[PDB]
From a paper:
For comparison, we also performed cryo-EM analysis with a mixture of Kap114, Nap12, and excess H2A-H2B without RanGTP, which produced a heterogenous mixture of particles that included unliganded Nap12, the binary Kap114•H2A-H2B complex, and small populations of two different assemblies containing Kap114, Nap12, and H2A-H2B. Nap12•H2A-H2B•Kap114•RanGTP resembles one of the ternary complexes, the Nap12•H2A-H2B•Kap114 complex, except that no RanGTP is bound in the latter. In both complexes, H2A-H2B is sandwiched between the C-terminal HEAT repeats of Kap114 and one subunit of the Nap12. In both the quaternary Nap12•H2A-H2B•Kap114•RanGTP and ternary Nap12•H2A-H2B•Kap114 complexes, H2A-H2B interacts with the C-terminal HEAT repeats of Kap114 just like in other H2A-H2B-bound Kap114 structures, covering an extensive surface area of ∼1,600 Å2. The smaller (∼120 Å2) Kap114-Nap12 interface in Nap12•H2A-H2B•Kap114•RanGTP (and in Nap12•H2A-H2B•Kap114) involves the β-hairpin of one Nap12 subunit (residues E288, R290 and Q292) contacting the Kap114 h19loop and the h20b helix (left). The Nap12–histone interface involves acidic residues of the α4–6 helices of one Nap12 subunit contacting basic residues of the H2A αN and α1 helix (right). Consistent with their histone chaperone function, the Nap12 and Kap114 proteins in Nap12•H2A-H2B•Kap114 shield substantial portions (∼1,800 Å2) of the nucleosomal H3-H4 and DNA binding regions of H2A-H2B. For instance, although Nap12 in Nap12•H2A-H2B•Kap114 does not form <4 Å contacts with the DNA-binding region at the H2B α1 helix, it is <10 Å away, close enough to likely restrict access of other macromolecules to the histone. Furthermore, the ternary complex is dynamic and the Nap12•H2A-H2B•Kap114 structure represents only one configuration of an ensemble of possible conformations. A similar structural arrangement of the ternary Nap12•H2A-H2B•Kap114 complex suggests that it is the cytoplasmic import complex.
Numbering used by the authors:
A (entry chain B): 17 to 99
B (entry chain D): 81 to 365
C (entry chain A): 4 to 12, 16 to 67, 80 to 293, 302 to 895, 927 to 942, 963 to 1004
D (entry chain C): 37 to 126
E (entry chain E): 83 to 365
Write the structure that this text describes.
């Protein structure tokens, strides 16, 4: 798979299909969806690491919406980015 | 246990041979069972054809829902959870002239296919461009000739700019004998030659052009190149075998491509079309 | 004791917060002490109040107190219901009960709810009905009201209380308050046709209307006037709520008629009262007039109009308190008459009532009011109230008409004239006549022949009265009357040009006077009036500079008093743009001396403040720019503009340290330098360099820095031949800023500046970048590297082309340094498929490889060609021979062709290191 | 509805093998991912339409990320995007 | 989502599609009925072969030379040359051959070769299974659709229980489970009338003779404690879901998954394929 080829776990196919349905441009460079999926997975991994940090702040190994919100609170820049 | 097998008395070995003969008889009975199932399944495909055609007309906009079917759909919606279909006041204010500007369900079959787990992975955007013109997906059982089932894909020549074929169909074939488990086993598949309007619109190949005053041959020559590429439309023109190359190269070809091709065909035939509406809306997941 | 005293002693607050945060057995101990304090209602009042407060706060919230919680709950029910309990203790118990219902038992707490229910039904404990009212306010739900059965039971209790005439009047008050709560909850379910809820609504409304019909027919002699007034008030508030919210089917028209008759009689009775009583009278009259407004559709009889008019005259007359307040400070009068005041009183409700009548009733009211004001002319006491009623009638947007309207109107006009003329007339009556004359003329703009002469006479008379009399209230009232006149008709046409100019002068003088002590809202009203004056300012050759400069100075003085006033600032924008909208050639040299010096005053004033943000300051900067652009300015701007503006703008840009002022001043200063004569600008070109040096320095935000680039473009465009010694300063400042700034747009703009310098002279720019140093390294090392990095993200075909040209010049120049300088960017991903976070990247960042600038730019251009887009033969110098035989793509292809022609010495060496894919891109681009 | 479930679990386990997440927080994370995609893709479309190129390339995505994300976040997102493109381009 | 947000034309078209879906569901119900009719028809043909092989296994019937020759040909074609007869085996006299009537541990060996069920067999279960003669299958026609399983034991010589035949029943849900198949419903089974606890292979036994220390009475004790076994296939999970069984329902759901897997394995592989699984060629 393309995600496997780039080492990504998130599906480049979903990102490419979202771009297509959005029709953000008359053509999309093949590297563009890979780059976008990589960025999205980077932000997801950041949020998940902070969620693990929050669950540990909660003395638990299971992430829940409370832990996710606390994780967003923990990181100021991501706090402003996500809001 | 080979030692135990040797330990069996000659009489018990004869009994085991008779039991194996009984198993073979059961195999022939299973063959007749499968024949009867195929015949009655064909009958029920005939029975399904009217409803499938009617929903296809609804999808394409050729037909408009009647108030009775509308009420039946509403009461079905009240069952389970489909309140998405409950028409609100804002929509009733609309007029058919404004609504009918878009006729049919846009990208109904494209969405239905892309919602299907195994098959959607093969559909590239270039393939999806043709799928926009897909308005029908039909089933046909090869009662005549070699056993198998044929998938039908329909398009409009006057609309699509890719090929002049109104219908593209894929074929699957089974062996003359049943499988060990009693289910059908597969034979080499075949696909149609897509009548591309031009090679540029062709989606299964990538082309290059160059023109050189090649001094190596004293030729002012123009050259063209064609390279097959991965695409869902490679689902057609399935692999075929040449003995000498079959033994070395196409052994892995049959190991890999045939498995995926058969899995995709079975998934389509079983999951998709019987639940085309649910698959389009995703409820069939 | 210690438990109570420590909690209610800094030990008091420490112990209170300690209690609240505990949620612990320790809380159960202090909570036990407080509960025992609450139980002993015979003593410890203050500690009981403190306990109630703490319990209310605690319940909002680990539940060890649960054992003692229920004990105090059962005690608190009694504390609330026992009327002998203290007032504040009772209220504490009640809202604590409400809070407990909210948190613990949103559904009925059966013991408390049933006990209070029964107590209300039988013993009629008023505190209980108050508790129920707040309960409905806070914790009940409409579904609970309808299907929970609470609504029906409550409504039955209330109906029983209202039916039992033995119930005391205060009990009636409580019952009616709870009935309002019940209707408020009921109307919340506007989704009628719900069979159970619809039937409940119908029965409840029918019974309520019947009972309220019964209640009003009652009479109570003179037992208690305050209670009677509250009783009538709540009854009519009920009736208004029903008439407004619920369907016409529920509240039938016959009931409307009988309630209307009874409401007129109640107006009579309430006015006869007064033989805080007055405030209760005003409230009851507010609600009665609301009901009359709602039922206004019905017919009205002559005696009924007489009663309504006389009662409203008695009610609407100003209380001595309001008259004193207005006379002491005209600001309050301006606020109230302009509608900015928030208070709502009987007079506003009378305004609502009169405006809503239909044409026949409205005509009859107008006739009655004219007849009454004719007689009341001698009786000054009621005159202002009747004038206000006339104003409300005329403010009704409908055709006042009828048989005898002409004669009554003549009489009314004569009465108004006499009111104006009489010198002994009271102040407020004169003000109301002044404000009412415009309405009288407006609604009779037709059917009143000689309207133009009468408008002229009345406007002149009112302006003269305002000027001569020195009662500021009258001045403000006359300004508002002028504002109303402007809407009524085109004063210039009716007055004529000369009279119009005279009235403009007079209104300007009045504004100059009253503006001395205006309030902020008064300032807004004055700004609106001035806007009205400006419109009539003739742009015809009759225009006179006296009026224009007076208007400008008034605009600036009014706003200067309260710069932070945003509303005044925006109205000043409107007035100022209407001023500048005039077009006349010779006078745009008079504007330089006329308006511009006023701006300099604003800039100087803020100077002591160091030009911190102020909406007026932004306004003046905006309109300096707009004035400079509006002026013909096809040739150079008149030199006078430079002499005034340059120094204030230079100081603003040198000292200010906030984004908005710097941006606006920067754009204005750029325009000034761009459009002015270069010769006169030449001697002071040094000062602009001081300004530029200050902005490029980090002591200002990057928001200012990015705008610098266009300013440098302007400087070099105007002064291409004097700039040369100053290039070094500009280049060094911009380069030191660029390497330190990290904002994308800022560095893009600074790189645009560098490209502009290189296009001006590549050798000079290279030399300065080599000689100048930051952190003791050649700027080219940092500057070229960062430039290439930024070029990867530059946007816009214009900037891309500029980058292409600049890099082409760099490549052609072929100095040693441009060859040795190696750039960062050639990437290899870090090992592993794991997703690198910031914490991860702190130890495992991705890796890059370096190449000489020429190779890097070749790779970048090849990539750009790729994006915009046997032929694979190597030795591309021969491919050029085979190939040889304004957009980015065209210019860049031409660049590559020229490079292959000239730079073969280095380009061929670079090509050899080039990859095959890049070579393929080069080949396909050459097509 | 958006579903990145199995891949969210994979990323979490790679970051923290002993850590899990509940499906509701997973849906919220999908919402965050969709918002990020929407902003990046929208502004990248802005850049593509701005240029006559009329194409959303990896350059458009990189510029959109640089404009959107803060300094460190933008730098790291760009780093991993270029990493993924280089790995894919092999 | 947005398809609903689209004008009411799309909503009404989808409503018609749902009506057609309900009609197709009715047609599919009739289709399932026809499939069950034909399945029972061919199960009637299956039953004689299964019964014949069961008689052969138990020794109640003997093969014939033509059957032996056909089996020889089929084995030669199969390449499973292990079953082939040898002259040394032919030397065995009739007296030696007839010492055992049926195939020793035929069903036991076949179940041992089976992937999952063999794990459930204990040594005592293996001893009991030697008395297992036949395995029969049937379809449920009345009420809920389903299939029934049967085992035959030679109770006359069986020293463990008097149950001549044990039957196991399976149930399906009332309507069509999505995807056009049936989903499981809870199962029921019979109870084994064990001759004694010592022979009860579903139980481990303890014998105690005691003189009570408190009451000083004299008593002899027979004690029982259930154990896992192949006959735990019987006494299946009680109910699909009930208020009083929730704590039980946990293990009931787990054992339901396991038992449905076992039953599907039986139905698909073992009863239709018994010879190869006994010989191990099916592996």
């Amino acid at each position: 798979s393309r995600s496997a080829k780039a080492g990504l776990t998130f599906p480049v196919g979903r990102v490419h299909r979202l771009l297509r349905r959005g029709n953000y441009a008359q053509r999309i460079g093949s590297g563009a969806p890979v780059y976008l999926t990589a960025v999205l997975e980077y932000l997801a991994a950041e949020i998940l690491e902070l969620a693990g940090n929050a669950a540990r702040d909660n003395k638990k190994t299971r992430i829940i919406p409370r832990h996710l919100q606390l994780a967003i609170r923990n990181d100021d820049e991501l706090n402003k980015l996500l809001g | 246990d080979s030692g135990y097998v040797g330990g069996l008395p000659k009489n018990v070995k004869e009994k085991l041979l008779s039991l194996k003969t009984l198993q073979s008889e059961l195999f022939e009975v299973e063959k007749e069972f499968q024949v009867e199932m195929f015949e009655l399944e064909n009958k029920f495909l005939q029975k399904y054809k009217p409803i499938w055609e009617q929903r296809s007309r609804i999808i394409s906009g050729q037909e408009q829902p009647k108030p009775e079917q509308i009420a039946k759909g509403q009461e079905i919606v009240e069952s389970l959870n489909e309140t998405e279909l409950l028409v609100d006041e804002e929509e009733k204010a609309q007029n058919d002239s404004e609504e009918e500007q878009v006729k049919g369900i846009p990208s109904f079959w494209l969405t239905a296919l892309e919602n299907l787990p195994i098959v959607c992975d093969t559909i590239t955007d270039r393939d999806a461009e043709v799928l926009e013109y897909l308005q029908d997906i039909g089933l046909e059982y090869l009662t005549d000739g070699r056993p198998g089932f044929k998938l039908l894909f329909r398009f409009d020549s006057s609309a699509n700019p890719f090929f002049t074929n109104d219908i593209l169909c894929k074929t699957y074939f089974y062996q003359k004998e049943l499988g060990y488990s009693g289910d059908f086993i597969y034979d080499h598949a075949e696909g149609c030659e897509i009548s591309w309007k031009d090679n540029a619109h062709n989606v299964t190949v990538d082309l290059e052009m160059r023109k050189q005053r090649n001094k190596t041959t004293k030729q002012v020559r123009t050259i063209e190149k064609i390279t097959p590429i991965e695409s869902f439309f490679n689902f057609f023109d399935p692999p075929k075998i040449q003995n000498e190359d079959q033994d070395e190269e196409l052994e892995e070809d049959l190991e890999e491509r045939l498995a995926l091709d058969y899995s995709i065909g079975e998934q389509l035939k079983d999951k998709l079309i019987p639940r085309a509406v649910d698959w389009f809306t995703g409820a069939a997941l | 004791n210690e438990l109570i005293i420590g909690a209610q002693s800094h030990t008091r607050e420490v112990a209170e917060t300690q209690l609240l945060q505990w949620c612990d057995s320790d809380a159960s101990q202090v909570f036990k002490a407080l509960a025992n304090v609450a139980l002993q209602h015979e003593a410890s009042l203050e500690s009981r109040q403190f306990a109630l407060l703490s319990l209310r706060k605690l319940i909002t919230m680990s539940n060890v107190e649960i054992d003692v919680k229920d004990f105090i709950r059962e005690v608190l029910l009694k504390l609330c219901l026992n009327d002998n309990e203290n007032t504040k203790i009772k209220n504490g118990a009640s809202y604590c009960i409400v809070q407990i219902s909210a948190v613990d038992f949103p559904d009925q707490w059966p013991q408390l709810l049933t006990v209070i229910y029964d107590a209300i039904s039988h013993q009629h404990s008023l505190n209980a009905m108050s508790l129920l009212n707040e309960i409905y306010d806070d914790v009940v739900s409409e579904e609970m009201f309808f299907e929970g059965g609470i609504g029906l039971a409550t409504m039955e209790i209330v109906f029983k209380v209202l039916n039992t005439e033995t119930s005391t009047l205060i009990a009636k008050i409580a019952a009616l308050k709870l009935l309002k709560a019940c209707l408020l909850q009921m109307s919340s379910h506007n989704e009628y046709d719900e069979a159970s809820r619809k039937s409940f609504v119908s029965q409840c409304l029918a019974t309520s209307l019947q009972i309220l019909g019964q209640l009003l027919t009652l009479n109570f002699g003179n037992v208690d006037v305050i209670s009677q007034l509250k009783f009538k008030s709540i009854i009519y508030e009920n009736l208004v709520f029903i008439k407004n919210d619920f369907s016409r089917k529920h509240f039938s028209s016959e009931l409307q008629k009988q309630f209307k008759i009874m409401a007129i009689q109640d107006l009579e009775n309430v006015t006869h009262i007064n033989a805080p009583l007055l405030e209760t009278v005003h409230d009851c009259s507010i609600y009665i007039v609301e009901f009359l407004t709602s039922v206004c559709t019905l017919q009205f009889s002559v005696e009924e109009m007489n009663k309504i008019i006389t009662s409203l005259t008695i009610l609407c007359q100003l209380s001595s308190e309001t008259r004193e307040i207005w006379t002491s400070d005209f600001n309050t009068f301006v606020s109230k008459e302009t509608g900015l005041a928030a208070s709502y009183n009987v007079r506003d409700q009378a305004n609502e009532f009169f405006t809503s009548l239909p044409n026949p009733q409205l005509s009859l009211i107008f006739k009655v009011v004219s007849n009454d004001i004719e007689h009341s002319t001698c009786n000054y006491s009621t005159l202002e109230s009747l004038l206000y009623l006339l104003q409300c009638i005329l403010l009704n947007d409908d055709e006042i008409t009828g048989e005898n309207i002409d004669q009554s109107l003549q009489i009314l006009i004569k009465t108004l004239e006499n009111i104006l003329v009489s010198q002994e007339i009271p102040e407020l009556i004169l003000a109301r006549a002044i404000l009412t004359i415009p309405r009288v003329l407006d609604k009779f703009i037709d059917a009143l022949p000689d309207i133009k002469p009468l408008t002229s006479a009345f406007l002149a008379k009112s302006l003269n009265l305002a000027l001569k009399s020195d009662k500021e209230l009258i001045k403000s009232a006359t300004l508002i009357a002028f504002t109303y006149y402007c809407y009524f008709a085109e004063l210039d046409s009716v007055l004529g040009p000369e009279v119009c100019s005279e009235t403009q002068e007079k209104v300007i003088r009045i504004i100059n006077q009253v503006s001395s002590d205006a309030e902020e809202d008064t300032n807004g009203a004055l700004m609106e009036v001035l806007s009205q004056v400006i419109s009539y300012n003739p742009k015809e050759p009759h225009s006179r500079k006296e009026i224009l400069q007076a208007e400008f100075h008034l605009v600036f003085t009014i706003s200067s008093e309260d710069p932070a006033n945003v509303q005044v600032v925006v109205q000043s924008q409107e007035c100022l743009e209407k001023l500048l909208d005039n077009i006349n050639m010779d006078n745009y040299k008079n504007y330089i001396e006329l308006c511009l010096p006023s701006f300099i005053n604003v800039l100087d004033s803020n100077n002591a403040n160091n030009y911190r943000y102020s909406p007026l300051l932004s306004l003046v900067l905006e309109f300096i720019t707009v004035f400079l652009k509006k002026k013909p300015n096809d040739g150079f701007l008149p030199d006078e503009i430079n002499q005034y503006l340059f120094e204030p703008l230079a100081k603003v840009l040198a000292f200010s340290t906030e984004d908005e002022t710097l941006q606006l001043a920067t754009e204005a200063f750029s325009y000034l330098i761009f459009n002015t004569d270069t010769r006169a600008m030449e001697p002071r070109l040094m000062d602009i360099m001081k300004v530029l040096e200050r902005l490029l320095s980090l002591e200002v935000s990057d928001s200012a820095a990015m705008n610098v680039g266009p300013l440098v473009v302007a400087i070099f465009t105007r002064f291409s031949k004097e700039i040369q010694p100053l290039i070094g300063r500009i280049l060094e400042a911009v380069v030191v800023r660029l390497i330190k700034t990290q904002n994308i747009s800022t560095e893009q703009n600074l790189l645009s500046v560098l490209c502009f310098l290189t296009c001006n002279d590549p050798k000079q720019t290279v030399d300065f970048l080599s000689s100048f140093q930051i952190d003791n390294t050649d700027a080219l090392t940092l500057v070229m590297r960062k430039w290439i990095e930024a070029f990867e993200v530059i946007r816009g075909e214009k900037r891309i082309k500029e980058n292409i040209v600049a890099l082409s010049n760099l490549f052609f120049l072929n100095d040693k340094r441009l060859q040795k300088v190696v750039v960062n960017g050639n990437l290899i991903p870090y090992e592993g498929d794991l997703i690198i976070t910031r914490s991860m990247a702190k130890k495992m960042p991705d890796r890059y490889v370096q190449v000489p600038l020429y190779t890097k730019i070749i790779k970048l251009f090849v990539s750009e060609l790729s994006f915009q887009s046997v032929d694979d033969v190597l030795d591309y110098d021969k491919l050029k021979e085979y190939i040889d035989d304004e957009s980015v793509v065209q210019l860049l292809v031409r660049f590559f062709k020229e490079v292959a022609s000239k730079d073969v010495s280095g380009f061929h060496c670079i090509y050899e290191t080039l990859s095959d894919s890049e070579r393929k891109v080069l080949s396909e681009a050459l097509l | 509805k958006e579903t990145y479930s199995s891949y969210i679990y994979k990323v979490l386990k790679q970051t923290h093998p002993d850590t899990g997440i509940s499906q509701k927080s997973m849906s919220i994370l999908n919402s965050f991912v969709n918002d990020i995609f929407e902003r990046i893709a929208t502004e990248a479309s802005k850049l593509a339409a701005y240029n006559k190129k009329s194409t959303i390339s990896a350059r458009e995505i990189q510029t959109a990320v640089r404009l959107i994300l803060p300094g460190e976040l933008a730098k790291h997102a760009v780093s991993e995007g270029t990493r993924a493109v280089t790995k894919y381009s092999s």
